[PDB]
Amino acid sequence: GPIRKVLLLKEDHEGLGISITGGKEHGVPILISEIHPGQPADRCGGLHVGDAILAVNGVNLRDTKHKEAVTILSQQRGEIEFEVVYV
């Protein structure tokens, strides 16, 4: 599908509210496998199961290993911009 830019607002006591799978070491993008109900990703409205996370706050995630992506994603605070695509 088309590449989308999506804004997520997270409070500091929260996680993102997603499960991710995949990573470069598996030859698969960082993929959203779960959107947890009521948590920030669900609330933002624009992130969905099956979306590949291409970048977050300008950090490319296309070639990142799984754990690299976890570190990068979990670092982000407040108003967080995602670049995603549903394939």
Partner: peptide
């Protein structure tokens, strides 16, 4: 199990 590892974040 997921096809590949999964992390909740």
């Amino acid at each position: 199990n997921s096809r590949y590892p999964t992390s909740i974040i």
